[PDB]
């Protein structure tokens, strides 16, 4: 299916910042369109988005350069090529950029085209993206509806409260379909607003559509979530489990973990592991993301020995969707799960490779949004088409989050009996 | 272009509540999909959405009944019909529902199908929705890019502060294209966050993607907006004007207006508003009096209407019977257009036309509960409405409309002029 036109444009993301949208047009009239979510433009470890840095537009956050890469050299290199050959398309862009971290054209440019190409190819093949992804994956007809971990309470750098943990999430493991999981999520989300209102706390929402009320401790956040779960008529631990992201790099100083909102105490790597362990005995927390600093591999080795048999230990900053880092982690018994941010790697082909590496090693892959999102819902198709089993795509408000849940609804409706919702067993450590 | 399948489903809106999505499929494969935004389930003046009221699902807010109406009675009535005949398609649904307020099937069911049908027909005709809308409107090839009024600060019932006024908005009138207007909005939006953070105020967002910080008065609210516009490098009154929504019913008591942050008679409240428009470049005032206060509104329109846009929202509820009576009685000079408040594309085109014929302005509006659907962008362009009210510059429920406007302007160029200040009534 020959590519005939590629169009790049600068659109606006859910935080009001520019991002890249691409369209891939094929002979026969087939069109795919996708957008890149927000990412890092500096740093040594992940694929880098290209930003303009022109202070006179969007406070330096323009993406005109990345859009120009799409419309110019990327378009020129891809016109006439076969969109169905995803690896080939991705390789052309990867080689043309020439940098490991896609920092010439920008991972935002390359990813937008990579995804739009895949959508266009699916259309040409008369099938939805999730079906095409399964074919590209060498696992045709193999699907699941992912178990969502849904942002609910924010802290640390993502709030202005005394909660140290960056976010707490609910997982409707007791649901029997993704539609039910979404409804459960919605009901808990609404009951939490009522619970917080009665406490005199603020219920306006953050980037991911959840709450950041002025709670005074990590324990208070867990308690308020438990209360909302009860209010909604669900059973904590059976119907709904908890997941957290510590973003522990945010409190790492001089080789120790200092928690302000815990009386500014300075835990060793081992002590912080046991702090977390105690939380997991007090509440049904079954997944912990970035529970130590990304550099703290000795600490992660210990945390994995102590918690890994019964708790999902998700590397986000730890792995930055990097197969080179993931491979070494696996070799060294570091964590047992990885957050998949496709814009940290920059192409669909490479994203499939990361998901596969995790699965082959018995690690779980959790398909993730970014803080800056769009109306795009490609991660829903990605999670289903690779049968990843889990998704982290926000609270139950803001269409930058809910667009993904709606797409999961459409996909489950279409696939029916062919896309099981497996519930708690998707989570690493849960049988 | 023959309808061969209609599918309704329950999806989730931007506030986490259910709404209706519909697909209309035509012979040859053409498909359109759209969703209803949030609306009213009760009341005697507007079209009503149908809600389930099952306490065990979605706190009683399920839309299974409206979705069933799409999949059953609506589907079978419309299958076989020509999707290009929008008025005919809408007439079938309206007649079948058989009520005056669409309360049998729900305005949510009817609108979702009405819009999805229009998109399907547009696809059959090999054209974008905005182009099809212009043809349906009988104004083929007539377009404009709307001047956005963008939520920026919330107060009243839409906040927990000491601001009486419900909504303050910015209008980037000085922009030359909607793409520029959108950048200007984004820049002011980000500068306001900076200003609020410097004051130790909360910068989390409300339903429309704007801020609702703990401001002590209407005066403080306008002050921070002015500061942000300046910080962004724009001139208030020139590059950017101000619009507001009083929601004046919220302080209406015994025929008087009691603010509790500033007991006005109808005339006295009009002059209170007049005083604000002298002090700040407020050029548009929505629901400046209670919807029932028609003698008050005639007075407000006489006093302010030559120089200020006076937008009926609760006053008109997108109802042409009310708008007609308003026009003849000299009531307001503008109307907010909420397509789910009337319930069909055909009736929406009629409301916009009635407004325009009387010299009133039509402001195409979002609802509090939205989706990623961007139909209102195509609607504003295809009817050359001239103004849009679709949120602050955050949340993709808002920003998806701005993105669609960018896509449309990219295609149309000079064929869809951004006319700026002059779109506003009184300007």
């Amino acid at each position: 299916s020959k590519i005939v036109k590629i169009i790049g444009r600068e659109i606006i993301d859910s935080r009001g910042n520019p991002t890249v949208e691409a369209e891939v047009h094929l002979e026969g009239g087939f069109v795919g369109m996708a957008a890149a979510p927000s990412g890092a433009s500096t740093g040594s470890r992940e694929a880098l988005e290209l930003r303009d840095g022109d202070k006179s537009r969007f406070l330096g956050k323009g993406v005109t350069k990345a859009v120009a890469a799409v419309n110019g050299p990327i378009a020129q290199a891809l016109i006439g090529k076969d969109a169905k050959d995803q690896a080939g398309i991705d390789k052309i862009m990867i080689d043309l950029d020439g940098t490991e971290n896609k920092s010439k054209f920008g991972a935002n440019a390359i990813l937008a085209v990579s995804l739009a190409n895949a959508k266009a190819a699916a259309a040409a093949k008369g099938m939805p993206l999730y079906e095409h992804i399964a074919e590209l994956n060498g696992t045709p007809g193999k699907y699941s509806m992912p178990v969502p971990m849904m942002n609910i309470i924010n802290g640390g750098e993502h709030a202005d409260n005394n909660v140290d943990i960056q976010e707490f999430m609910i997982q409707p493991v007791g649901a029997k379909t993704v539609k039910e999981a979404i409804r459960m999520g919605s009901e808990v989300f609404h009951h939490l607003a009522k619970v917080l209102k009665a406490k005199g706390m603020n219920t306006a929402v953050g980037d991911e559509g959840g709450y950041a009320p002025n709670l005074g401790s990590n324990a208070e956040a867990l308690a308020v979530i438990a209360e909302a779960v009860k209010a909604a008529g669900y059973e904590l631990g059976k119907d709904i489990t908890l997941a957290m992201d510590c973003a522990a790099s945010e409190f790492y100083k001089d080789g120790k973990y200092v928690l302000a909102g815990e009386g500014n105490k300075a835990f060793t790597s081992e002590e912080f592991t046991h702090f977390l362990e105690e939380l997991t005995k007090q509440y049904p927390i079954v997944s912990i993301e970035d529970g130590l600093d990304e550099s703290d591999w000795d600490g992660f080795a210990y945390q994995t020995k102590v918690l890994g048999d019964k708790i999902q230990l998700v590397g986000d900053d730890l792995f930055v969707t990097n197969t080179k880092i993931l491979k070494e982690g696996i070799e060294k018994g570091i964590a047992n799960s990885i957050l998949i941010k496709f814009n940290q790697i920059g192409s669909l082909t490479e994203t499939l490779a990361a998901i596969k590496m995790a699965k082959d090693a018995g690690y779980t892959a959790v398909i993730s949004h970014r803080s800056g999102e769009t109306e795009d819902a490609t991660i829903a198709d990605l999670a289903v088409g690779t049968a990843a089993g889990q998704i982290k795509t926000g609270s139950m408000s803001r269409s930058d989050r809910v667009a993904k849940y709606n797409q999961l609804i459409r996909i489950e409706e279409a696939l029916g009996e062919k896309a099981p919702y497996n519930g708690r067993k998707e989570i690493k450590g849960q049988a | 272009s023959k309808i061969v399948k209609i599918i309704g489903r329950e999806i989730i809106d931007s506030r986490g509540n259910p709404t209706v999505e519909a697909e209309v499929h035509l012979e040859g494969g053409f498909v359109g999909m759209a969703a209803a935004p949030s609306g009213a389930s009760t009341g005697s003046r507007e079209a009503l959405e149908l809600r389930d009221g099952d306490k065990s699902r979605f706190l009683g807010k399920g839309v299974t009944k409206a979705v069933a109406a799409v999949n059953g009675p609506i589907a079978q009535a419309l299958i076989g019909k020509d999707a290009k005949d929008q008025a005919g398609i809408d007439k079938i649904m309206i007649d079948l529902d058989g009520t005056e307020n669409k309360s049998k099937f729900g305005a949510n069911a009817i609108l979702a199908v009405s819009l999805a049908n229009a998109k399907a027909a547009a696809a059959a005709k090999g054209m974008p929705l905005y182009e099809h809308i212009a043809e349906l409107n009988g104004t083929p090839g007539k377009y404009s890019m709307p001047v956005p009024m963008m939520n920026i600060i919330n107060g009243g019932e839409h906040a927990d502060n000491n601001v009486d006024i419900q909504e303050f908005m910015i209008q980037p009138v000085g922009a030359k294209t909607v793409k520029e207007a959108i950048r200007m909005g984004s820049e002011v939006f980000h500068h306001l966050a900076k200003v609020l953070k410097a004051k130790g105020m909360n910068t989390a967002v409300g339903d429309e993607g704007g801020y609702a910080p703990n401001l002590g008065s209407n005066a403080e609210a306008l002050a921070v907006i002015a500061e942000a516009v300046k910080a962004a490098g724009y001139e208030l009154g020139k590059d950017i004007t101000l619009a507001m929504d009083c929601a004046a019913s919220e302080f209406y008591k015994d025929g008087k207006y009691v603010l509790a942050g500033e007991a006005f008679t109808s005339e006295e409240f009009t002059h209170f508003l007049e005083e604000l428009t002298k002090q700040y470049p407020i050029v548009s005032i929505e629901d400046g009096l209670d919807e029932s206060d028609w003698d008050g509104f005639a007075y407000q329109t006489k006093v302010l209407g030559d120089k200020i846009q006076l937008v009926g929202d609760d006053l008109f509820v997108t109802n042409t019977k009310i708008l007609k009576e308003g026009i003849e009685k000299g009531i307001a000079n503008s109307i907010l257009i909420k397509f789910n408040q009337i319930g069909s594309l055909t009736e929406t085109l009629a409301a916009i036309k009635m407004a325009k014929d009387a010299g009133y302005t039509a402001v195409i509006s979002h609802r509090s509960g939205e989706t990623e659907d961007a139909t209102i962008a195509d609607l504003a362009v295809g009817t050359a409405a001239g103004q849009i009210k679709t949120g602050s510059m955050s949340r993709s429920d808002r920003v998806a409309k701005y993105n669609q406007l960018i896509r449309i302007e990219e295609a149309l160029g000079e064929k869809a002029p951004y006319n700026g200040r002059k779109e506003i009534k009184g300007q």
Binding site: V31, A377, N406, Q407 | M33, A374
Partner: peptide, 15 residues
């Protein structure tokens, strides 16, 4: 193409 079709939120069902 419509944003719904191009984005892959709706699919063709008929030839």
């Amino acid at each position: 193409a419509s944003p719904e079709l191009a984005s892959g939120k709706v699919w063709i069902r008929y030839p």
